[PDB]
Structure formats: structure tokens, C-alpha cells
């Protein structure tokens, strides 16, 4: 069984590279962040522009939804994150503390904490309602590319140009695991699997790996794409067939069979690096976004 994603809409509107696209958890919206300093909201089914959210002073690297779909957090090159009320478009809090660019952000499931990762090589944990920094983790010896909470919020996973993935205890901030294989090329992306049992990690040697982080074991390797420079987001597709999804520096979206590790589709259409992809939470819908020479977001739909 292979999917048959086909292009349904192309979303134009950002005036610089698009850095991240995220489906709201209720399935209704797509949020996009951009080097143009803007967040835009789109209809997740019709692709129709909804609104622009503004306030950062420089490019935006990442954006993330709260569990109830009412808030966003953004991470900016201006060294802050911002918490936004989606309905009003207003900035509720500015999180200040990182000493250089913020690349990655996420709420926890409970949505009372935010986790952030930065060029300054730290991971920070923030109080959503006070806007204050609760903990600063000396997480890595090189820039942090991704941070993600697990499904019950008790763990954070981080990935870094230092070649390491690390797991952290949310409450204590203690490091609980350091994952490394036969080598340590920059780790450009990581997230937990939806069941919390695995870690999916990208390295800048054109390679994705599925880890059992408890056992410290690499279980699946996914290759065939091009990833040596950019921090490309990746996903578990779980609404139909069980896929791994990732962008690529040959401007394609790649889809693999999670179990067999074979490529099952490549989506053609973007004209620049596909740095971000997202899988809709209830339907077989994929959003992809590309860098400065493309500037568009594409929405694809599959029958399985």
C-alpha cells in the first residue's frame, strides 16, 4: 500500500522563506511562520488566508499550537519567543532570556509550559501564564535545532549540532539520556513518536533514524533524500498508512513506509528546499513549506 498525495492548494503570501507550518490540533487551521517576521493563519481544508499575526522584530524560525488550538508560541531570531492569542492576534507574553536566536519551540500537552531551543546552546522551560523562565538547561555544546515534549509532558527531547540527542526530565531538568550512534554528525531535527516510545531524529548526513530512546537503540533508518545543510522538520503520518514524512534539499517531500523503510512517494512542486512539513491530525493531508526562492506553502491530500 502506497499513499497518493496530490497537490490541492498552493498558499502564497509570505514575502520571504517560510520556516514552519503547523496544523492546529482541532484540525481547522494551518499556521505558518516566516523569515518575513510574520505568522499567517490559513484554512486547513480550503487553503484560504485567514489573518496575519505580527510583532517579532526579525525572522521567525518556528511556531507551535497549544493543545486547545487557542494559543501560538513563536521562536524568533530577535532572541525572544512570543505567546499569541490566536482569536485576537495579540501578543500575550514575550519570553526574554536567550542570548541569541531562538530556533525551536513547543507547548507541553498540559499547555502550562513552553520549551525553547537556541543558537546559544541552551534549552529553556517557561511558565506560559507568567511569561517567566522557570529553568535554563545547559543542554548542549552547540546550537540547539529542535525541542519537543512527549505525550504526557514528563520528558523533553532536544537535538543539537553537537551531534547529540538528549532527553530531559521536565520537572527536575535533569538529563536522562544521551543518544549517539556510530558517529555524531549534526542532529538537525528530533521529535517523540505519538506513542512516546520512540524518537525520530534527522542528521545532516542525509539520514533519518527511529530510536528506542529507553533502550538506546536505533531501530529504523530512512534514506534516499538530500539533507546536509538545513534543519528540515519531519513527522509521523498516522491518519492512514503509517508513514515517515520529511522535506528535502532537492525540493521534494519524501514519504517512507515506517516499517519497511522504503520510499512510497515523492511530492514534486516546490522550487526550493522543503524545510517544513506537517501532517493533519485527522485527515490524510500534508502541508509543506519552502525557502527563499519558493516562498509558498503546499497542501496535499491522499486517499490513504
Amino acid at each position: 500500500v502506497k499513499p497518493n498525495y496530490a497537490l490541492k492548494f498552493t498558499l502564497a503570501g509570505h514575502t520571504k522563506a517560510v520556516s514552519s507550518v503547523k496544523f492546529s490540533p482541532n484540525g481547522e487551521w494551518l499556521a505558518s511562520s516566516s523569515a518575513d517576521k510574520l505568522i499567517k493563519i490559513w484554512g486547513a481544508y480550503d487553503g484560504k488566508f485567514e489573518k496575519t499575526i505580527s510583532g517579532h522584530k526579525l525572522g521567525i524560525s518556528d511556531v507551535a499550537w497549544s493543545s486547545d488550538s487557542n494559543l501560538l508560541v513563536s521562536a524568533s531570531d530577535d532572541k525572544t519567543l512570543k505567546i499569541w492569542d490566536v482569536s485576537s492576534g495579540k501578543c500575550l507574553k514575550t519570553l526574554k532570556g536567550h542570548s541569541n536566536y531562538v530556533f525551536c519551540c513547543n507547548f507541553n500537552p498540559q499547555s502550562n509550559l513552553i520549551v525553547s531551543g537556541s543558537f546559544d546552546e541552551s534549552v529553556r522551560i517557561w511558565d506560559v501564564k507568567t511569561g517567566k523562565c522557570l529553568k535554563t538547561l545547559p543542554a548542549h555544546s552547540d546550537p540547539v535545532s529542535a525541542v519537543h515534549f512527549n505525550r504526557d509532558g514528563s520528558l523533553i527531547v532536544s537535538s543539537s549540532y553537537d551531534g547529540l540527542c538528549r532527553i530531559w526530565d521536565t520537572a527536575s531538568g535533569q538529563c536522562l539520556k544521551t543518544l549517539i550512534d556510530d558517529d555524531n554528525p549534526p542532529v538537525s531535527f528530533v521529535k517523540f513518536s505519538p506513542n512516546g516510545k520512540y524518537i525520530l531524529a534527522a542528521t545532516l548526513d542525509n539520514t533519518l533514524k527511529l530510536w528506542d530512546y529507553s533502550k538506546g537503540k536505533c531501530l529504523k533508518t530512512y534514506t534516499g533524500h538530500k539533507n546536509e545543510k538545513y534543519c528540515i522538520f519531519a513527522n509521523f503520518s498516522v491518519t492512514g498508512g503509517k508513514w515517515i514524512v520529511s522535506g528535502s534539499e532537492d525540493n521534494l517531500v519524501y514519504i517512507w513506509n515506517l516499517q519497511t523503510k522504503e520510499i512510497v512517494q515523492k511530492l514534486q512542486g516546490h522550487t526550493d528546499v522543503v524545510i517544513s512539513t506537517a501532517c493533519h491530525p485527522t485527515e490524510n493531508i500534508i502541508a509543506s513549506a519552502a525557502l527563499e526562492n519558493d516562498k509558498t506553502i503546499k497542501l496535499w491530500k491522499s486517499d490513504c
Binding site: K16, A17, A35, L58, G59, D142, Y161, E292, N293
Partner: protein, 311 residues
């Protein structure tokens, strides 16, 4: 300037030469690359002779020691941002300067290194790698955006962020007023004047000796007799964001030569391609220039090295 040789980076789909210097074994040129490699080339054949992994980001600038035993490299964002390499028999790192985005050898006896971190100058010993001195005064700083600290020809003085320092006393002796946003200035090889953007100041008196409008936003290098100055203008737009900065080559597409004693113009050379670096050999017979042939400048970077005969 008669073209003598041209070559592009071997192996690579997109040629990534970023900076160059002649090595002590003439006929061979050292080039940094956008992947943090140091490479050795025969400048006449275009044959790659060696490749060494120096940094985890693009090499921005480099300088060999006059005696060919040492090399300084600076990278783009990865630490260490600068390093010192031994070139005797085996090539390897002697010391590293993790936060200095720019480094130069001392000039008379090349026994020290001066690094720059923002507004701050660091002086290091070549043997121990120890930091011997930090030169910074926040009340005198000009906060030049492309500040580069540099020794004078006898190494007794330092120019940093438009402030003249006496090394032995670690004391600031004069602050030159700020008349541009980026360029902090160099010593003239004669040791008696300084070139700070368009202003030429006399070190005897601190009087203004010359206004040279053509030197605005320029980096400069001298032939080894100290009789001719080369200058090329940085490509700028301060209103450029981070992405827009990467779209650009370091320099525009022309360089100028000037008489080193009175700054009168000699030649204006437009190679019709944006410039990444240029250097001369110790005898000033040859000029090497890293030229971008990319159609959209450093967006799709594709550089060649051109060797010109200095007439």
C-alpha cells in the same frame, strides 16, 4: 593586469572558493571554501593538491605566516571561530580562539596573534596560545560594526574600534572620531599614519592628512614594497537581514589601486563579477582574485580564482 590563469574548485558542483593566500611554496595558492575546507592549488594548472577540514562553517578569511610554518583561519558561525594551524610536515591545529571572528599575525616578529570579538581585541601568544591582553574601553569604543583589531608594523601599537592603544602599557592613547558605521581602520605600512575609512590621520599630530572618498567601506592591502594600495568596497545594505546578508558576496565587482604615498588613483579594475578576496605574492608579480560568476551573486555562489599578472 593581464589574465594568466583561471580555475574553479575541483569535485564540487558549485565552486565554493571564499578566500585565498599564496603559500610559501609559490606556484601554489591556499583557498578557504564555503564548507570550512582549506585547499591547496597549483595556480597555473588549476590542479587541487590537498584538502584539509578546518572548520564546521564557511572560511571567511585566512593569513599565512611569512615563514610558511603557520596559518590563521576564521570561520563564519561555528566555534572555534578562529584557529592557528601548523604547516610543517603535517598540517594540524596548534591553537584555537573560540570566539574571535577575525585574527591577524603580529607584523614585525610574528610571535603573537590579535583576534577580534565585536568591539574587543585579544592578543595571544603563538607558542602557549595564552591570552596575553584584552584591549577594550567602553567609554572610548566606537562600536564599528565590522571592527577589526590590528597591530602596527612594529607591534608596539594596536588599532581597535577606532582607538589607538599602546601595547606595552595596555593603555589607550587616542580615540579617533567616528565618521562611518562599519570600518575601523588599518595602519599604513610606513608606520606614521592610519587609514580609517575615508580619513587619513597623521600619527605625528592626529591632523587629517587626506580625504579619500573612494575608500568608503573598503578593505585595503599593500604591495610588499608599500608603494601601492589595493582597495575593494564591501557590499552593504545595513538594512539587510541575516538572509539578505548571505545573498551577497563580501565585495563589489571592482577594486582600485592607489599610490601609497599620496593616495592618488592609479587604476580602476572591474572584473564584472563580485569579489570574495584578493592577494599578491611576496614579489608582487601576481594577483589572485576570487570572483563569483553566479548569476544572482552569492545566492547561487559559483566562484573561480583568477590569476593576474601585475604590470
Amino acid at each position: 593586469f593581464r589574465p594568466i590563469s583561471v580555475f574553479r574548485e575541483a569535485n564540487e558542483d558549485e565552486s565554493g572558493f571564499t578566500c585565498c593566500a599564496f603559500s610559501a611554496r609559490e606556484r601554489f595558492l591556499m583557498l578557504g571554501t564555503c564548507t570550512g575546507q582549506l585547499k591547496l592549488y597549483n595556480v597555473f594548472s588549476g590542479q587541487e593538491e590537498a584538502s584539509y577540514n578546518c572548520h564546521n562553517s564557511a572560511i571567511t578569511h585566512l593569513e599565512p605566516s611569512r615563514d610558511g610554518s603557520l596559518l590563521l583561519t576564521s570561520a563564519t558561525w561555528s566555534q572555534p571561530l578562529s584557529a592557528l594551524w601548523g604547516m610543517k610536515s603535517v598540517f594540524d591545529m596548534k591553537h584555537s580562539f573560540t570566539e574571535d571572528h577575525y585574527v591577524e599575525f603580529s607584523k614585525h616578529s610574528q610571535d603573537r596573534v590579535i583576534g577580534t570579538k565585536g568591539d574587543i581585541a585579544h592578543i595571544y601568544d603563538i607558542q602557549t596560545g595564552n591570552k596575553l591582553l584584552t584591549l577594550f574601553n567602553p567609554d572610548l569604543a566606537n562600536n564599528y560594526k565590522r571592527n577589526c583589531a590590528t597591530f602596527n608594523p612594529t607591534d608596539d601599537l594596536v588599532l581597535n574600534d577606532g582607538v589607538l592603544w599602546d601595547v606595552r602599557s595596555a593603555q589607550a592613547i587616542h580615540k579617533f572620531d567616528k565618521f562611518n558605521m562599519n570600518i575601523s581602520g588599518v595602519f599604513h605600512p610606513n608606520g606614521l599614519e592610519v587609514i580609517i575609512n575615508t580619513e587619513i590621520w597623521d600619527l605625528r599630530t592626529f591632523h587629517l592628512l587626506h580625504t579619500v572618498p573612494a575608500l568608503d567601506q573598503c578593505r585595503v592591502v599593500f604591495n610588499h614594497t608599500g608603494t601601492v594600495m589595493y582597495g575593494a568596497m564591501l557590499q552593504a545594505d545595513d538594512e539587510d537581514d541575516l538572509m539578505e546578508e548571505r545573498m551577497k558576496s563580501p565585495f563589489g565587482s571592482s577594486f582600485r589601486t592607489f599610490n601609497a604615498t599620496d593616495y592618488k588613483p592609479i587604476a580602476t579594475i572591474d572584473v564584472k563579477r563580485n569579489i570574495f578576496d584578493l592577494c599578491t605574492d611576496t614579489k608582487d608579480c601576481y594577483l589572485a582574485v576570487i570572483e563569483n560568476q553566479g548569476s544572482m551573486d552569492a545566492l547561487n555562489m559559483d566562484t573561480v580564482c583568477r590569476l593576474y599578472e601585475v604590470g
